[PDB]
Subunit: 393 residues, 4 copies
């Protein structure tokens, strides 16, 4: 398994560029130059690279420096052919965003954050990004009395709808993807899980161009099923982008390589992205974006090892996932457990609530005790998946 | 603090009626007769009682027995004046619901579950319930390959929309409230948090009459902020009912008395239900339903102690919450932290995205470093709330 | 992968006999005859069977019944060749044990629990068991003021020391294994994790014959690394028994098949059991016991499938973990990362504290920034391990 | 509530000196001069101050600088009267400690870490500290194959025993306190909880002078009951120090003010520290040390407010916990629940195992169903405690 650009593997500049400062220590690696990052990613088989405005252009850079940076960055894209499919804004590192960007209690920080986003959409358009991600990492609180909870959501809506109207107004070919996170850096973040994010989009004026950017480790921090969560987003037509990594449990965000966290969950994630639904339905066709960090204990050889590892993990899982579904023993196990039977409507074509109510066979003369003897054989069906995962079938 | 019917304290028949069988042992108390339950609740100052169809009428009861039970149950309501504000269906105890009601892989169980719900709506209407709760406790899986995740949500939609159309069709004055739960009894339940529940309602044909029934302990099982979660439901106009109890951490569901779990969170929950939002907005006007279980170590004196305790806890918190907001030191602390400033729109009346972009004062000439020096004083504001909670101010 | 009695797979009678009742619903399966379990387990490759006194002999059994039941069970054992390596006592099911056995607040109850345990030591002795397990499931509290925590540990000690002294006195070849568990059925359980279990053993008069019985799921219920916990028990030579199962996060105890929870963790537990420590150390040589529950969704084919799945899972992980450590590339990766270097003593032979502080090479002239450049290459070692787990190497 | 030096409130220099940098953003506050901290802490009622060698003396400090800094700090101490009860070492910040100090895989690094600790014992000795804390923050792994777990505990033991022997050898009046932590900065940390800390002490050659330094938040990070964990440390006479702060669940370490996390748990920790065990037992008599961080949202008034809030929180809980145990109703409730009864030995004076099994009253003729009727009334005791906490009694 060697990745190729058709695999659609994209990586953020901040992933491989992560130098190692954590909350208990300083950087263990030297800064990575962005041009070197592009050359190196391209050589590993990456299709694209993504970034945050301040990942490339310093917060204080002059207009001269911005243009110098962009010129060399664009030259490296040209030299390699790496695309830039998603752009995002840093609304969390500088001290001004300590209470948030869009939901900052201070009004002058809310306008500064939103103006920073609007300018960044212009850069997104210019780079040819299809997706603009919004991760509201400082939107939230440590204490419950800190915020007017209704005002926080009106202010979040205002920012997202202003940005959305702006795209529509300039006719940029871009969609906004919100990225939910339960906590860290705030004690509680607004729109904590896939569900809150999706619910919030339905209250928006320009909801039609706003979708989601779920991250594996983020839903796992609330102990949620990531395949269940992305299935709902997909079902709603709202899975616009995805961030893949590993998390081992509810604890700080680890950002491990995809597959180095909950492996069985990683397998079924890949089955849903690659294979879709057993009875048919929607499919995710976007880039497979790795949002992780190379462990601070490792040197630059480990940084490129880790980038490679993300792509290998995905291709090994993909392989096992295609052999699993293709397996006739598996298809028959699925049929026994009622996987395809769930696809049939409960009601008959034209049957009404009254009809079903008044159908003695479905209720009054129904044998509940006979119906309960059914062996769904979910254990055996799970054993078949693990055996394909273990490369034993 | 003595509760009165105007307090709107409702209790489920299964709460006080919980006999003590848990996963590791049998019942430690004798069955509680439902007529005795009504008489006793009414005497404690409860306004209403709620139940599950099989809490009152056995699954196997004949038509004769159903009518006998209802006649005595209605007589006790009459004798005491307790209302019945919410009715729900048991779609989880009998062995036929082992894979779920509405999302059961077996089609004949899906029709049986839905017919059971339709008949129960008819009883809800007859009792004068305003709300019909749907807790899909067996909808989900232990293993990821068990279900077609898109089919599971189409089947969930079908059941809820059939039930919704049925109410609309008979002109019952009822709303459906969905009750999200992350896990237990299933390893993963569909619509795990407030957010998934709200997102799901926007995909429904008859969404207009479907809202939520959040439970304190349920959101706390995913480590979520219950006040944040109910704030979003309220903001969306979807908080139709609420279940109050205590949970101490991510572990099995405890169902403790309200206030016996996360006390500081209980305080702010009460502040939101009683006081609403600091800048004004929506308010929750429904019943304050206690969904808990009296600890199995205690006898029937403890059962009535626990019921009383729920109402006392709420009234003590209420008191502290009204004194907290009324306090001029607190109102000034709030003003300093920007609680009211969050209420102001980011944009000026008529300002456009372009206008804000091109306003040098909000971006190009903005002093980010000056703006970052603001002491939001969130610590001090939190210390004032705890001091009111501790009854020291 | 075909298990043979040489593998030492032991099963509890309660595992495959679990009937399917949980907190939200009734049993989905009929009771399992003990004779049948013995015969079925012997035909799958099991080595032995374990039980709780009440799994076999009802609480209320008359003497005649006890003899009968035991006659039936010993016959089965004689007929099949199964061993009985561990025997345990139920101090959790009867309503009298609602506050614990040993740490019950009621003294008369404490005395009955210990009496119930002493009698069970005789039985364990008679069955030829090597290990006697103590799972204090009801020892704990829901509320912090319910117990005097110093007196609960004194009471616990009294119980365990009385049982240990009695073993020594009777000259039985039995060791006690304490089984830690953090919560469920109680809100908080005493001796919640392997460390708390080991700490307590050191305060016991007869701690020489007292050790641990860690269970996979229990440790994962507190979010701890099961492999690290059994390494500490092994290290102190206190790993007397082990309970293998699966758990998919911090939630209710799932009791899934071994390997059906966290797969990589399972993989590394099998490497520790089979391969021991990279530098040498104690090795675990007891039964590999599965304490799980066949999902309640599955009927009786599922029950024997799930029993089988345990042993298959173990044998597949073992194949992989043996291949993993035998690989030259893996051994090279381990050397590079300093796995072997960890085994060298920090100090030199007869080097003292004063000798080392004084040594300029070690401190005063130690080049900290050049030392910090070492690429530990832990990511690459982890990728190598996963690739062996997926059977791609 | 005004703290006085008699209260023994100690603060780390790093607590109020925390600058606000975290994993997603830069410092929000300027560095705090050590002299100022000392003077500010003395004016608020602090009793003492603690530090890490590098909080005070930079890593690269020349000798002249070290003398200067120490001259400045001892002057402050002399001027204010503050004590220095605990001194600790930073084995986590420099990039050389990326794999740990004591359990680093690199031997040269292990030797530097121990050398760095030995030198710091001299300094601790010179400052007049009673306790020397060891927080092994980088001891652990992200991945399961990174370490030989038996060799990591040998390496740890070597380090701690070398330090302990050296103390004994120099005749210093210092005790070592090990500080357990489950995760962060590493994915898994060695000796993760109070039980694991206590277990390890028992395998040490000089364990007589080695004890624990439990922190509130750390134990809550694994979801454990902090009050139960310090009761076990107390019970074994191993509670040498304590770190008080707040944590709002299983997530990143928050370091909130003491009482700003789980309030009821805090309440019961203060009852244990102040009131001791209901039946008598050891009492904790050391410093009440706050290891927290002023939220990064707050400016310097917030910093002194947060320092103040710690001591106010402690004094309010103490007032309440003293009132709680003095209440006649509460004492009556405790008797009823068997709190005092737990303290009576299970066996009778000179009663043996054989004596008890033989006793018909205790076993053979014990009426288990009548015993089971006892109403323990734990809910009512809990309601009583909360009412004292809320100041309504
Ligand atoms: Al991301
Ligand atoms: Al409920
Ligand atoms: Al077990
Ligand atoms: Al500390």
């Amino acid at each position: 398994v060697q990745p190729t650009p058709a695999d659609h593997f994209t990586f953020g500049l901040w992933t491989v560029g992560w130098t190692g400062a954590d909350p208990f220590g300083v950087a263990t690696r030297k800064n990575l130059d962005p041009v070197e990052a592009v050359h190196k990613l391209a050589e590993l088989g990456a299709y694209g690279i993504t970034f945050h405005d301040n990942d490339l252009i310093p917060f204080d850079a002059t207009e001269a420096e911005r243009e110098k940076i962009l010129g060399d960055f664009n030259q490296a894209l040209k030299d390699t052919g790496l695309k830039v499919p998603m752009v995002t804004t840093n609304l969390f590192s500088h001290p001004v965003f300590k209470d948030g960007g869009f939901t900052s209690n201070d009004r002058s920080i809310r306008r500064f954050a939103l103006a920073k986003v609007l300018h960044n959409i212009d850069l997104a358009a210019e780079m040819g990004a299809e997706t603009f991600v919004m991760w509201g990492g400082r939107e939230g609180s440590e204490y419950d009395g800190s915020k007017d909870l209704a005002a926080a959501l009106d202010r979040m809506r205002e920012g997202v709808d202003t940005a959305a109207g702006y795209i529509k107004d300039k006719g940029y070919n871009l969609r906004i993807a919100l990225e939910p996170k339960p906590n860290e850096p705030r004690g509680d973040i607004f729109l904590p899980t896939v569900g809150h994010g999706l619910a919030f989009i339905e209250q928006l004026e320009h909801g039609d161009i706003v979708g989601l950017n779920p991250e594996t480790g983020h839903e796992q921090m609330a102990g949620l099923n990531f395949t269940h969560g992305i299935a709902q987003a997909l079902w709603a037509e709202k899975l616009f982008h995805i961030d893949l990594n590993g998390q081992r449990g509810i604890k700080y965000d680890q950002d491990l390589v995809f597959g180095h966290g909950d492996l069985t969950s990683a397998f079924f994630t890949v089955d849903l992205l690659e294979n879709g639904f057993p009875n048919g339905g929607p499919k995710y066709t976007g880039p497979r974006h790795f949002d992780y960090k190379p462990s601070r204990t490792d040197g630059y050889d480990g940084v490129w090892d880790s980038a490679k590892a993300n792509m290998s993990m995905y291709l090994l899982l993909k392989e096992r996932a295609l052999a699993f579904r293709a397996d006739p023993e598996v298809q028959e196990a699925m049929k026994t457990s009622g996987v395809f039977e769930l696809g049939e409507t409960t009601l008959n074509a034209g049957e009404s609530a009254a009809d079903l109510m008044n159908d003695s066979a479905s209720f009054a003369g129904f044998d509940a005790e006979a119906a309960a003897e059914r062996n769904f054989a979910f254990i055996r069906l799970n054993q078949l998946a693990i055996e394909h995962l273990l490369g034993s079938r």
